[PDB]
Amino acid sequence: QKSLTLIVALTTSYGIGRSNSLPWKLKKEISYFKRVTSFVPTFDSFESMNVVLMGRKTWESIPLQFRPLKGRINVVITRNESLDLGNGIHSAKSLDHALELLYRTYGSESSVQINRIFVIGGAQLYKAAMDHPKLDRIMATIIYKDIHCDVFFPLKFRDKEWSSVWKKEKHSDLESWVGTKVPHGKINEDGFDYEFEMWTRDL
Numbered sequence: 335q336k337s338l339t340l341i342v343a344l345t346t347s348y349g350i351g352r353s354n355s356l357p358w359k360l361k362k363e364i365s366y367f368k369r370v371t372s373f374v375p376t377f378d379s380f381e382s383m384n385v386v387l388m389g390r391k392t393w394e395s396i397p398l399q400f401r402p403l404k405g406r407i408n409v410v411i412t413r414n415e416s417l418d419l420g421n422g423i424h425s426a427k428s429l430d431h432a433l434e435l436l437y438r439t440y441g442s443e444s445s446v447q448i449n450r451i452f453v454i455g456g457a458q459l460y461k462a463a464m465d466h467p468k469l470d471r472i473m474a475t476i477i478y479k480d481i482h483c484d485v486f487f488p489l490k491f492r493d494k495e496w497s498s499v500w501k502k503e504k505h506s507d508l509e510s511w512v513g514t515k516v517p518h519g520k521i522n523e524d525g526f527d528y529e530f531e532m533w534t535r536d537l
């Protein structure tokens with residue numbers, strides 16, 4: 335069971351969504367998201383691919399022109415065996431089942447190898463990922479504007495109460511893990527000030 339990575343864009347009040355949608359239109363954040371979930375270190379095996387895990391509500395909210403996230407192995411978690419109708423859209427009862435589907439489906443008899451696993455969201459899938467003993471990384475984008483949302487991140491990993499578990503890494507570590515250079519400091523895109531951060535937990 336490889337390490338799990340959580341990627342999220344949230345306000346300072348931990349808000350992450352409004353009405354099954356995003357209360358903001360950031361063009362530079364979305365590019366970060368894609369490169370991060372799509373990047374694979376050269377040294378790893380040649381047929382290495384990434385996986386993005388997502389909840390059901392998060393998958394139905396992505397416009398058909400966008401989903402499924404290309405260049406990545408897509409898995410939808412659902413406590414319901416319903417029709418996904420995909421080009422191979424895997425679905426599992428939980429994080430642990432999803433990981434089991436991957437290892438079984440992708441391995442020796444595969445011409446496709448699993449690289450990094452990303453939990454791309456959904457409040458409910460976040461809490462599950464936060465409770466999992468394998469999550470160890472959190473790629474966070476902080477919107478410095480207390481926008482009005484109605485969906486929030488479960489754990490306040492940036493507050494004091496958790497400061498002994500979650501440690502924010504320097505930007506040099508944030509860039510190396512991503513293999514490329516990324517904007518250091520605030521970024522003001524259309525009256526929004528946000529920045530990238532990477533937090534690591536001890537296992």
Ligand SMILES: NC(=O)C1=CN([C@@H]2O[C@H](COP(=O)(O)OP(=O)(O)OC[C@H]3O[C@@H](n4cnc5c(N)ncnc54)[C@H](OP(=O)(O)O)[C@@H]3O)[C@@H](O)[C@H]2O)C=CC1
Pocket residue numbers: 341342343344350351352353354355356388389390391392393395411412413414427428429454455456457458459460462485
């Ligand atoms: N800003 C950001 O970074 C992100 C924001 N979002 C936002 O999140 C909101 C969607 O709401 P939310 O309901 O929280 O979305 P979720 O992605 O958490 O989806 C929840 C649904 O996913 C399945 N699911 C979730 N957790 C589990 C679990 N632990 N075990 C098994 N199955 C599970 C369910 O199946 P079932 O339906 O069958 O019960 C459940 O109804 C939207 O506003 C969306 O835009 C999403 C991703 C990123």
Ligand SMILES: Nc1nc(N)c2nc(CN3c4ccccc4C=Cc4ccccc43)cnc2n1
Pocket residue numbers: 341342343354355356363364367395396397400453454455473474475
């Ligand atoms: N850093 C980071 N982390 C995330 N988890 C993340 N989630 C999203 C969510 N969004 C959604 C969500 C709800 C409604 C619309 C919509 C539109 C487009 C897309 C496209 C691809 C993936 C998500 C998504 C956006 N930006 C993110 N940034």
